[PDB]
């Protein structure tokens, strides 16, 4: 689990969004595993606007942060799960690192701010949904 709180927005994995997220929906994209909802309180986070390919993510299944080198956001095949049919997930970045299903929502950051959130993984890989292209989160 986990979320990004920026301005009056909450960014979560679409497959983990709550009834309240859907009732206050701003935008969602099943191909990216992202959902953004509106909030009343001002958020705690800043979004990176950069091309970094190194950063640090939080891994809840180890209670630790790990440094990672990750690929540029791209269209990557993701196998069927309880949450989605087999499909290409867009704006996804892969890295070598530990992840388990409950790790979704962990934040990846670089020196500029929040880069994205854990969305996929397995077999020593971890995949992050990028949010750096969502310029409207900043206003
Ligand atoms: C952290 O992810 C993993 C880690 C280890 C093993 C498996 C996973 C992947 C995983 O749990 N899912 C469920 C959530 C949907 C996701 C997606 N974004 O399409 C792909 C499949
Ligand atoms: Zn950066």
Q: Which of 104, 126, 129 to mutate to test ligand 1, by most ligand atoms within 8 A of the CB atom?
A: 104
List the one residue out of 124, 89, 95, 122 whose CA is nearest residue 110: 95
Residue 85 structure tokens? 């049919």
8 Å CB contact between 75 and 89: yes
Q: Using a 6 Å cutoff on CB, does residue 118 contact ligand 1?
A: yes
Are 109 and 124 part of one and the same domain? Answer: yes
8 Å CB contact between 138 and 127: no
Are 53 and 24 part of one and the same domain? Answer: no
Q: Which residue range forms the structural domain that includes residue 62?
A: 45-139
Are 38 and 56 part of one and the same domain? Answer: no
Q: How far apart are CA 121 and CA 103, in angstroms?
A: 9
Q: Using a 6 Å cutoff on CB, does residue 119 contact ligand 1?
A: yes
Q: Which of 14, 81, 119 to mutate to test ligand 1, by most ligand atoms within 8 A of the CB atom?
A: 81
Are 58 and 88 part of one and the same domain? Answer: yes
Residues contributing to the annotated binding site for Zn(2+): 50, 52, 110, 112
């Amino acid at each position: 689990s986990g979320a990004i709180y920026v301005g009056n927005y909450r960014v979560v994995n679409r497959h983990l969004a709550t009834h309240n997220d859907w009732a206050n929906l701003v935008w969602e994209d099943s191909s990216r595993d992202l959902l953004v909802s509106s909030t009343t309180a001002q958020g705690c986070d800043t979004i990176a606007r950069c091309d970094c390919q190194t950063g640090v993510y939080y891994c809840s299944s180890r209670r630790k942060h790990y440094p990672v080198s990750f690929s540029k956001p791209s269209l990557i095949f993701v196998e069927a799960s309880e949450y989605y049919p087999a499909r290409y997930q867009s704006h996804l970045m892969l890295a070598v690192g530990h992840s388990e299903p409950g790790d979704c929502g962990g934040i990846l950051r670089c020196q500029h701010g929040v880069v994205g959130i854990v969305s996929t993984g397995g077999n020593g890989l971890v995949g992050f949904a990028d949010v750096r292209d969502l310029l409207w989160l900043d206003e």
